[PDB]
Amino acid sequence: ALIVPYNLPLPGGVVPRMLITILGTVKPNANRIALDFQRGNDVAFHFNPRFNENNRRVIVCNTKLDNNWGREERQSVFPFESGKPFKIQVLVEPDHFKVAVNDAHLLQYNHRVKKLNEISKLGISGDIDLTSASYTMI
Ligand SMILES: OC[C@H]1O[C@H](Sc2cncc(Br)c2)[C@H](O)[C@@H](n2cc(-c3cc(F)c(F)c(F)c3)nn2)[C@H]1O
Ligand SMILES: [Cl-]
Ligand SMILES: [Cl-]
Ligand SMILES: [Cl-]
């Protein structure tokens, strides 16, 4: 297993047509997972499954600018399950990140951070065993 938290450099940032694939297994008693597409200290796209927020499962997405979190975008479709293997695919498209989990479209997140070629790190944290993290151009 890769060490979590894991940093995946994204050389030259992101660009439309870039597909990021994360394979892992959720830990059995999971509480939280996060993917952080970072522009230096800023978080262009935070993708955050929460397994127990007031006894509900929700994915929270947001952006952090100068240490300030913005307006959350929330999705109650929640494909993750404690103990189970997953695949997250994040496709960069011109207006948004497009996320599919286990081959089913989940959500899109409109670009707030405009300088895509400065989004040059992906952090992966939380309650997973991380198998692989990679990218390719489609
Ligand atoms: O709006 C999103 C923010 O919400 C709140 S902060 C917030 C409070 N009030 C309003 C807003 Br808007 C935001 C959280 O505390 C933030 N957050 C979560 C994590 C985190 C850290 C990990 F190591 C990890 F494994 C993980 F899965 C998640 N770090 N920071 C972030 O999710
Ligand atoms: Cl709102
Ligand atoms: Cl920007
Ligand atoms: Cl790669």
Swiss-Prot record:
Signal peptide interval: none
Main localization category: cytoplasm
Entry keywords, A to Z: Acetylation, Cytoplasm, Differentiation, Disulfide bond, IgE-binding protein, Immunity, Innate immunity, Lectin, mRNA processing, mRNA splicing, Nucleus, Phosphoprotein, Repeat, Secreted, Spliceosome
An example Gene Ontology biological process: positive chemotaxis
Post-translational modification Phosphoserine, affected residues: S76
Subcellular location: Cytoplasm; Nucleus; Secreted
Binding annotation for a beta-D-galactoside: W69, G70, R71, E72, E73, R74, Q75
Gene Ontology CC entries for this record: cell surface; collagen-containing extracellular matrix; cytoplasm; cytosol; extracellular exosome; extracellular region; extracellular space; ficolin-1-rich granule membrane
Listed GO MF terms: carbohydrate binding; chemoattractant activity; disaccharide binding; IgE binding; laminin binding; molecular condensate scaffold activity; protein phosphatase binding; protein phosphatase inhibitor activity
Chain span(s) of sequence motif Nuclear export signal: 114-129
Tissue-wise expression: A major expression is found in the colonic epithelium. It is also abundant in the activated macrophages. Expressed in fetal membranes.
Galectin domain location: 6-136
Protein task: Galactose-specific lectin which binds IgE. May mediate with the alpha-3, beta-1 integrin the stimulation by CSPG4 of endothelial cells migration. Together with DMBT1, required for terminal differentiation of columnar epithelial cells during early embryogenesis. In the nucleus: acts as a pre-mRNA splicing factor. Involved in acute inflammatory responses including neutrophil activation and adhesion, chemoattraction of monocytes macrophages, opsonization of apoptotic neutrophils, and activation of mast cells.
Assembly and binders: Probably forms homo- or heterodimers. Interacts with DMBT1. Interacts with CD6 and ALCAM. Forms a complex with the ITGA3, ITGB1 and CSPG4. Interacts with LGALS3BP, LYPD3, ZFTRAF1 and UACA. Interacts with TRIM16; this interaction mediates autophagy of damage endomembranes. Interacts with cargo receptor TMED10; the interaction mediates the translocation from the cytoplasm into the ERGIC (endoplasmic reticulum-Golgi intermediate compartment) and thereby secretion.
Protein name listed in UniProt: Galectin-3
Organism: Homo sapiens (Human)
Gene name tied to this protein: LGALS3
